[PDB]
Amino acid sequence: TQLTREQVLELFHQRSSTRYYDPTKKISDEDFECILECGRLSPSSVGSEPWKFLVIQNKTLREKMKPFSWGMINQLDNCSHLVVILAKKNARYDSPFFVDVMARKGLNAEQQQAALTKYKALQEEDMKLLENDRTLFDWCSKQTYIALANMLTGASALGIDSCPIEGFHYDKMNECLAEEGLFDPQEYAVSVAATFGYRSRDIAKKSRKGLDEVVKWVG
């Protein structure tokens, strides 16, 4: 709730990508539930929350991923928890998906038509998202990277290590998960994944570009 600049900086400095997990250690259900809340409570463009969190504790499913998940093949067997994040497909301003968005905010027929023209201008004019399906999906997939970032940070504040994962064949992971009946492949598609647990090895040297190279002040 309140931290000092030296605790805040250390909290973001201390989080590291953990590629080797201790299979003997596992996260508590209350610890992981608060990690998932970090995700659920994340902000998202126009309150869209275009995400779904699949928690893959089934061990037969983890083994089936191994062949096309080179980024986490040596993490799938030992991590305590695995999360695959999906992003909403085709979240157009006039889609049922956005009727639910407006409905969660209690919008009358007039409030909805004003919000609808705002969504349209955002998607069609401001960001040019309705050229094809991939650009619109990537917009919701961007929001899911917000939830991903917050789950990593919330985990690291609870002493739990993590690794974000993109190292897998999207097409094969999509098919494997949709054929296992875990989501409707016309409404959602995989966006990014993440492992959680406790490090087995040591945490390496934090390496990033300098602050003076990545910031330009405009005064």
Ligand X SMILES: O=C(O)c1cccnc1
Ligand Y SMILES: Cc1cc2nc3c(=O)[nH]c(=O)nc-3n(C[C@H](O)[C@H](O)[C@H](O)COP(=O)(O)O)c2cc1C
Q: Which of 83, 91, 140, 163 binds ligand Y (CB under 6 A)?
A: 163
- The answer to whether residue 67 forms part of the interface with a copy of itself (CB under 8 A) is no
Q: Tell me phi and psi for residue 192, to 5 degrees.
A: -170, 160
153, amino acid identity = T
Q: Cβ closer to ligand Y: 28 or 201?
A: 201
What part of residues 83-122 is at the interface with ligand Y (CB under 6 A)? none
- The answer to whether residue 197 forms part of the interface with a copy of itself (CB under 8 A) is no
Residue carrying the six token digits 């739990």 = 160
Number of residues that bind ligand X (CB under 6 A): 7
Q: Which of 71, 158, 169, 183 binds ligand X (CB under 6 A)?
A: 71
48, amino acid identity = S
- The answer to whether residue 46 forms part of the interface with ligand Y (CB under 6 A) is yes
Name the burial class of residue 196, with classes exposed (0-12), middle (13-18) and buried (19+) by CB atoms within 10 angstroms of its CB.
buried
> What CA–CA distance (Å, rounded) separates 62 from 156?
23
- The answer to whether residue 26 forms part of the interface with a copy of itself (CB under 8 A) is no
> What CA–CA distance (Å, rounded) separates 49 from 125?
21
Task: State how far the alpha carbon of 206 is from the alpha carbons of 10, 98, 161, 203, in Å.
Answer: 11, 41, 15, 9
Q: Cβ closer to ligand Y: 9 or 28?
A: 9
- The answer to whether residue 116 forms part of the interface with ligand X (CB under 6 A) is no
Least distance CB 181 / ligand Y (angstroms) = 25
| Residues at the site binding ligand Y, with contacts judged by CB under 6 A | 16-17, 19, 43-47, 71, 146, 163-167, 192, 206
